[PDB]
Amino acid sequence: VTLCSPTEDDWPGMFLLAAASFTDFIGPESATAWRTLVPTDGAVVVRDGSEVVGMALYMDLRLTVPGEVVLPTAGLSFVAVAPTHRRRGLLRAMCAELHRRIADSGYPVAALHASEGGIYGRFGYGPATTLHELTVDRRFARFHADAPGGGLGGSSVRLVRPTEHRGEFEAIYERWRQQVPGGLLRPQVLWDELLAEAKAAPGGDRESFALLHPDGYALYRVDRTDLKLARVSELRAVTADAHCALWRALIGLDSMERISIITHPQDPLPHLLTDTRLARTTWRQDGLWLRIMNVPAALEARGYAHEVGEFSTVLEVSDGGRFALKIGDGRARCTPTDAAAEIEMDRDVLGSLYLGAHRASTLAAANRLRTKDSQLLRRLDAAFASDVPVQTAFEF
Amino acid sequence: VTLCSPTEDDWPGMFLLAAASFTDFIGPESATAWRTLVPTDGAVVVRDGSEVVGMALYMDLRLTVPGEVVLPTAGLSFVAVAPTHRRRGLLRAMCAELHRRIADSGYPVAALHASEGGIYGRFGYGPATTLHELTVDRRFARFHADAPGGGLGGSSVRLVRPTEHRGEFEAIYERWRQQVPGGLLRPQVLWDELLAEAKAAPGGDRESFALLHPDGYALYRVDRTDLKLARVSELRAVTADAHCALWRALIGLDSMERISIITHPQDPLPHLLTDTRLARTTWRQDGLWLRIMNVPAALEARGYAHEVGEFSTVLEVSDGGRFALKIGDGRARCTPTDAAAEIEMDRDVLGSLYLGAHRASTLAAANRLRTKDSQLLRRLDAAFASDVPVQTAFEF
Amino acid sequence: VTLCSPTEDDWPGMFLLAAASFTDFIGPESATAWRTLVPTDGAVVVRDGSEVVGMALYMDLRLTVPGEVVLPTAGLSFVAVAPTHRRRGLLRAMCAELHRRIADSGYPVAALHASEGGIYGRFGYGPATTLHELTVDRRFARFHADAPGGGLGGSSVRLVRPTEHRGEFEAIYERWRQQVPGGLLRPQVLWDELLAEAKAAPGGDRESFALLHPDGYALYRVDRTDLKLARVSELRAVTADAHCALWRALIGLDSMERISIITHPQDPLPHLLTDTRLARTTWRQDGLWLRIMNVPAALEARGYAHEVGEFSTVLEVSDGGRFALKIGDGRARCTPTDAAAEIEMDRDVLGSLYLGAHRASTLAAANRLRTKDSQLLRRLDAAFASDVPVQTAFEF
Amino acid sequence: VTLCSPTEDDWPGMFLLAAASFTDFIGPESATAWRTLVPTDGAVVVRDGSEVVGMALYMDLRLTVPGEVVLPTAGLSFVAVAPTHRRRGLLRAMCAELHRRIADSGYPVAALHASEGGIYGRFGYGPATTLHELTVDRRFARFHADAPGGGLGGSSVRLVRPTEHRGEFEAIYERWRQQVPGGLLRPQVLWDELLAEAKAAPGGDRESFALLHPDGYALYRVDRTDLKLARVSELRAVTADAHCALWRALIGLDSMERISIITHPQDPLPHLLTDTRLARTTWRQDGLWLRIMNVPAALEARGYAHEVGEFSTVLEVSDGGRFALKIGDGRARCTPTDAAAEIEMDRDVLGSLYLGAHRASTLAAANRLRTKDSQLLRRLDAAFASDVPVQTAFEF
Numbered sequence A, B, C, D: 001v002t003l004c005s006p007t008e009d010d011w012p013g014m015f016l017l018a019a020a021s022f023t024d025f026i027g028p029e030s031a032t033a034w035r036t037l038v039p040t041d042g043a044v045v046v047r048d049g050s051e052v053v054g055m056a057l058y059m060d061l062r063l064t065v066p067g068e069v070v071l072p073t074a075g076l077s078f079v080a081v082a083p084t085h086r087r088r089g090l091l092r093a094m095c096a097e098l099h100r101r102i103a104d105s106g107y108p109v110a111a112l113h114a115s116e117g118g119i120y121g122r123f124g125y126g127p128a129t130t131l132h133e134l135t136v137d138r139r140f141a142r143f144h145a146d147a148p149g150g151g152l153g154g155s156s157v158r159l160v161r162p163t164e165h166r167g168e169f170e171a172i173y174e175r176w177r178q179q180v181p182g183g184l185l186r187p188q189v190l191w192d193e194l195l196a197e198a199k200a201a202p203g204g205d206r207e208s209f210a211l212l213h214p215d216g217y218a219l220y221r222v223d224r225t226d227l228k229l230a231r232v233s234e235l236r237a238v239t240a241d242a243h244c245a246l247w248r249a250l251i252g253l254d255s256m257e258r259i260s261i262i263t264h265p266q267d268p269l270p271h272l273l274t275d276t277r278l279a280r281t282t283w284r285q286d287g288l289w290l291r292i293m294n295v296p297a298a299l300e301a302r303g304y305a306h307e308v309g310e311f312s313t314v315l316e317v318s319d320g321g322r323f324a325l326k327i328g329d330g331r332a333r334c335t336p337t338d339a340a341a342e343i344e345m346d347r348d349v350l351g352s353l354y355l356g357a358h359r360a361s362t363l364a365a366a367n368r369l370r371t372k373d374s375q376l377l378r379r380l381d382a383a384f385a386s387d388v389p390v391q392t393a394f395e396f
């Protein structure tokens, strides 16, 4: 067992390990598209003597963070150890090698989507966004008087075939991802994939329809087995008007009993209805996980709340450095120091604060984040908070 | 049909309407205890010609709000219209009469627990706290290295009969409710009720056990039908140590597969585990609903974030007044003005911001809260936010 | 934390730990009856500083083993560690102390019923009997021509109130337990308990009825929630005639769709029907677990198959001795030796072979039982096998 | 209605009756393969006046019986009566005709797989092997210290595409079926069928993967609807090492919660784990059914336990002959006699004892097997028992 970059002849073995390791694997001729996002030296394989018994890679991604700043981001994915080589330390070896390469390439952060919430904390990854399934019983749903877009005169929302309005979706998503923390550049090849999932499958998923507004879209389909449920796969809205308009259209799906969507905890949909409770939260999970690769480069890159006054402190990341952190005017300066640490935390905890989805107060309550001054805790809390709520772009 | 204060001879008719209207009604000799919390002229009945076809009352409560300030609070409850007198405007008449009496008595706020999330918005009530059911699969649960109270040496947590350690629970709850927004004074008679629910029922609920720490307690019981589920009815912890210690004890219930609890969205339990995901959010609802009875008295009474700098603005509540609002140094001054409104909202929306559980940004996104300056929105957001997270005390 | 025999004043604390540790606990005034089966120095408690945080005891039992031989048996039960004192090594301390006392008292074997199949292997306990739930769809059930007791003329089976025919049940059970491996003497106090479970509970279990034959009985009751299911709590038959007669009566319960019973894997009921498949096996578990306390005393006490010819060998139990074992004429001689071991196994594996419910071939296939001669394996297999099939008496 | 051998022009009508009679029918161009195993005069059809309203056939099979002896075996299958011709005695006519031809061809035994356990007893078929579904919760599964193949150094097990390692599977199965009672020669055409079921179906079964050891294999696939369940379709192991190695690989399927397999009651898997209970028995049924066509030829062909001493007796099969049976040195001599019968049974009961999966004691308890000497019962029991446990090869 040795660690190597895969050659063209390894990929068939990687696809076999993929098929056996991921229930949701989309076959090799669709994995061709994701491969384009893997840089030269983005992948490691472990061979036995030889078949692939281990693999991991990263993709080149652009992640939006608070202050509408776009970071280069190594997206970890396609991580797998053969069932025949468990408890052999292959993951520890592969992750160490990719993190070496990710750091040496100058990525300030790495990101992934977890298959279990227990594996990735020990490698410096912290859950950074929260998924929120809302299911609406749309038979009872009435919009509030105060809701926009309920006036006698035209609807701006159209029902369309997704495949025929790609450019409009691309345009809206591009505007969306640039102004929202958690947003990812979605390259051409993943739009090719998204619109091939939109056509009906023989004895699989049903036809996907689109609701198109000048400033937003929604892709939805009826569930395979529950024919009274509509699953909103993706809703992107740039303006509050577009968000409300699109929800009026979805509550107008009179053949459905329930609309379900995976959104963020600050989704305003409940407040659009006369009865907040009709939009039930039916499921919550960690979305994107973040590993801060370079602490000073990442803390300096994002914006901070203009509301909190200027303040200084010393932050220690366990096996990650000690830094004089000064925050004011929504910018941070982060420099090396040997001064006494006022605030200590593991690198994963920093990942979790970074997009401003978890409050420092909460992590401190669990002792994930040590300090002896609670004034500094309130300040971190307010500084790291995000004006624009954190959303999740797409699974990779 | 006329509106009257009930006399001693009306209560049997009220109890009949209660039994027919509330599935969870606890019989008349236990309703005797709650009656003590109803002031003279706290109740209205509607008689037909005569049996009770309508009733509503308020109880005298002390609600803790941000800045560890305790408000007198009218707690609405025992609201019911006979199934024979629907769409007759009896609720509108009864609520109007109680709100007249509540206001004239000098209560700055009123509060209730909703049976539906659609009834109470139009009477000025806004959902103000969020309930969060966490279910833990305790077979997989491992505490983090960073977690307190996992060191060789004594446990401070004891397993006890609830009935034999009342004074200790009372002491801990009193300390808890005084330092947490949403906290309610729990009077003697509701401790009498809480410990009568703690004994096993013939073909009903099972025996309740207590986990007692110097600085916290947990009441739990095994579910009636699911014998592998433990329901934590109530966990109160004053210190992070007490909260962690009590959870180590609950994960130690080796005969159970799952521990469920109703807590708040900022509960640190997920962050105590190596796997955040093992604490699944299985259910979310509006907890306490708030009606601000006197806008200037309530905005002046609570504390605000010291982090946001001093700022002034003009707030209009629909049919509720217009006020020059100046906030700085965590105090607010709120005075009458006829100046142009910068910020507008219905009274219910104010109820929802008041305990700092909903962000103004979120309500603004839904157009529940109108302004043309987004800088002022960020400021409201930060000012009204609560350092100590908002919890729910007990249903009334 | 120290290990002590409990005094009369400890038992209230033990009952508290019991109530919190066992979902099926029957309250203290019924635990009074089982207490009579606990000898002086049969119990250990661990106190903290003081409440009971740990307890274990054994009861004096008479277990029937192959060759209709009755062994004195320490029955372990009432084992519990407080949820506040997990991973503290209290079980290891308590089990060590009881095993010291059990051995020094001259018990050749100890036995228990497991709450998990993973705890008790490391303390020398092997699963020794197998439980088998058969559910019959009695609407389709027809007895075979070859079945006894289907002839024109009287039925010998009567439907009776259990409480009125105690002596007859006692008589039949006494005959049953003396001729069946796994049989236990059931003392007077556990008959007092068995017939108090036979009366209907308010919002609990339904009335128990009895089917009484001269040479067997069946206790059954309709399920709480499934009113088309009859649960046979206990069927004891001395003669094949009695077993068949009692099943004709149970298939005659025309208001029921299904009869369920927990029996042994060799129960002949399937072979009584024209359709073997109508008696579905719906559930299987380990019944009684056995720890051989004195290897030579236990191997010498039981009978062996007369069919296998005389043979000698050397058996090593890990940390349990090495013995020259000679078996012939259904007796064994077991003496100390330092000669080379032909057969090796952990003490738990011996427990599992002892009642002849597990085949040595099967344990050898799993490498629980090492030898290099497969002829000796066939011989062990045949010797240790039981003519009369192994059954489970009652849970303790 | 008359009984005829089908001509080439009957098969389309037979396939229609098949499609309407068997839910699991695989279409006509796959039935082409099984047809090759049907000898000339292996099939009967009943025509009405003309469409096929009745059919039955046998296939030429080689069944392994105790003593690693291989019998020619008529495998009954494709038995069907049109729903329009029930209770017309067509099955009785067709079975009589095939049994005439099977006997006259010199097959000592016939075998089938039942669609109901109630049809086939009256035609002389006895259930002879037992199926056992084990489901493992693989999250908790830990192998015992004593288990083979858990040492630092290479795994001998590989994850492979089934279609690319046919010869290896064939080799291992050939070795397996020759040394195990219940084993069947699997001809080339049924390997062609087995590896066409191994590829993913559009809106059907998922891709099948293989775990390959030098001395064993496992075919598994994720369930259609339960994506956390892996179904092991087939596990064949020649050595205990291979069996353990393959189970370590299956417990290493970390994306699955549960591994299910259909195996035999003596499968050693439970004993490989620290917790026997984690391998739950979730389902049991009759596997292969056996009809002894020639009693003396079949009793003479198989081996018997060498452990039981030489003994003689007289066996009567109802309408099947009376025989002087002498068993010693694991051989039997079976000759015609008119001497008094010591042991009587229906032919089906003999089928059930023949592979040594049912104990004579058990069948005697049900009066399926009459004798007045219980010493002779113990001897039959031991003689007919099988050293190597009885397994089920494949459904036909």
Ligand SMILES: Nc1nc(SCCCN2CCCCC2)nc2sc3c(c12)CCC3
Pocket: A024, A026, A030, A031, A032, A034, A035, A038, A057, A077, A078, A113, A114, A115, A395, A396
């Ligand atoms: N990165 C990829 N993603 C996907 S689908 C996203 C599934 C999300 N998971 C992600 C993990 C668990 C939760 C949910 N497919 C492929 S194929 C292929 C790649 C790749 C990389 C290069 C070859």
Ligand SMILES: Nc1nc(SCCCN2CCCCC2)nc2sc3c(c12)CCC3
Pocket: B024, B026, B030, B031, B032, B034, B035, B038, B057, B077, B078, B113, B114, B115, B395, B396
């Ligand atoms: N206030 C009371 N509460 C209760 S139990 C709390 C149930 C919570 N509900 C509250 C509403 C819906 C959700 C859940 N019982 C009684 S009796 C009695 C009173 C009263 C007042 C005076 C006579």
Ligand SMILES: Nc1nc(SCCCN2CCCCC2)nc2sc3c(c12)CCC3
Pocket: C024, C026, C030, C031, C032, C034, C035, C038, C057, C077, C078, C113, C114, C115, C395, C396
């Ligand atoms: N030995 C006892 N048994 C029972 S009920 C049997 C339950 C079976 N379990 C046993 C374990 C798990 C499976 C199923 N109750 C009591 S009270 C009391 C004793 C005792 C001892 C002295 C005070």
Ligand SMILES: Nc1nc(SCCCN2CCCCC2)nc2sc3c(c12)CCC3
Pocket: D024, D026, D030, D031, D032, D034, D035, D038, D057, D077, D078, D113, D114, D115, D395, D396
């Ligand atoms: N013998 C065959 N088997 C199968 S699939 C095995 C199904 C098992 N059943 C068997 C019975 C019920 C339980 C389960 N298919 C065919 S097609 C075709 C034949 C045949 C014979 C000649 C044309």
